């Protein structure tokens, strides 16, 4: 608050605070059959049934 008329403040204070980031681990598992990966990627690029 501004000065004057019987009002005496604890004039403007400034922190400088250093805080830390907190890491987190998230796991997941995808299983895929080897048949569908191979038939969807073939060296002969003719179309499929």
């Amino acid at each position: 608050i501004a000065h004057g008329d019987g009002r005496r403040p604890n004039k403007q204070r400034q922190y400088i605070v250093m805080k830390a980031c907190n890491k987190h681990h998230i796991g997941a598992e995808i299983e895929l059959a080897a048949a569908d990966i191979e038939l969807l990627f073939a060296e002969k690029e003719t179309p499929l049934d």
């Binding site: 895929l32 080897a34 990966i37 191979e38 969807l40 990627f41």
Partner: protein, 314 residues
């Protein structure tokens, strides 16, 4: 120009980068998953280029070499590469030295009989002209064999990798873990046929993944004096069988030992032997017989070294 040649060699031995598939954007997820599945399908086919890509994934652990420094009269210049190494550390020397005992040099300290060892007795005398230069550096070759404390002082180290021999100081490098690379070939551990006693020979046990090599150090008397005898064994039968199989090998020694202990009993005299665990040879890699100058020496392959504490047997 010559600095660009090294840029092609470092960037051809780098590990493969981990796939970074962004799970927050729409089309960037679709084009990152497609490069996982256009790349596993080209690592499965039996073509040569797919096998060319398959070996860069290298999960190799490494050997940890120990650099020793031995006097040149306790260690021959004529040592076969792949000899097993011990360390005798009885006291603190005034200088930073170390005593490394090969199994043909520990034959001269022991004084075990040449009827047991016909071929490594002629070899251990032609390299060591008197046997005194070894025995002068151990002042307790009778009080460490009486009480049964010599096996507490040896630590197993591993096969030998490099031997820079000089006049007074010999530099010896060992391989304490893993397969030792020479200093480039892979050095396999070399044992004489005189010391190695197989257990897997017989007249259908499982073909396990692994077979181990043990080291037995056995206390006994010859010429009514304390001595010992170090033998090597090789089996993969698990720890409960082999300790029961080593007691069958030393049946003739214990029965001729306690004829004298039936006379008098000291508590320093009861401890008999100790079994270590040296390392693991892979299964059915047969050792190749070699000769030195005619010394039958079994050299193994892919022998990675381990270290077991000396456990007593009797």
């Amino acid at each position: 120009e010559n600095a660009a040649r090294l840029g092609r060699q470092v960037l051809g031995l780098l590990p493969p980068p981990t796939h970074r598939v962004s799970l927050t954007r729409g089309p960037e997820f679709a084009r990152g998953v497609r490069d996982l599945l256009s790349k596993y399908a080209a690592s499965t086919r039996p073509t040569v280029g797919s096998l060319h890509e398959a070996l860069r994934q290298a999960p190799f652990r490494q050997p940890t070499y120990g650099d020793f420094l031995v006097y040149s009269q306790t260690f021959s210049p004529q040592e076969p590469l792949g000899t097993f190494l011990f360390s005798f550390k009885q006291e603190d020397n005034g200088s930073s030295m170390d005593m490394l005992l090969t199994p043909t040099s520990l034959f001269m300290l022991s004084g075990m009989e040449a009827a047991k060892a016909p071929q490594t007795h002629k070899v251990a005398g032609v390299w060591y002209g008197s046997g005194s230069g070894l025995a002068d550096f151990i002042p307790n070759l009778s009080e460490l064999m009486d009480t049964g404390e010599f096996h507490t002082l040896l630590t197993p180290v591993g096969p030998m990798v490099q031997s820079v021999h000089s006049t007074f100081v010999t530099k010896v490098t060992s391989a304490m873990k893993g397969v030792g690379l020479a200093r480039r070939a892979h050095v396999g551990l070399t044992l004489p046929c005189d010391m190695l006693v197989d257990l897997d020979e017989s007249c259908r046990e499982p073909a396990g993944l692994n077979v181990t090599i043990y080291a037995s150090l056995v206390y006994l008397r010859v010429n009514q004096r304390p001595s010992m005898a170090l033998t090597f064994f090789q089996s993969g039968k698990g720890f409960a069988e082999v300790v029961a199989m080593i007691k069958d090998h030393f049946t003739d020694v214990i029965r001729t030992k306690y004829i004298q202990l039936r006379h008098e009993l000291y508590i320093n005299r009861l401890v008999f032997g100790a079994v270590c665990t040296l390392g693991t040879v892979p299964f059915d890699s047969h050792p190749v017989h070699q000769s030195l100058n005619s010394l039958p020496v079994l050299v193994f392959a892919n022998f990675e070294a381990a270290c077991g504490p000396w456990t007593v047997f009797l």
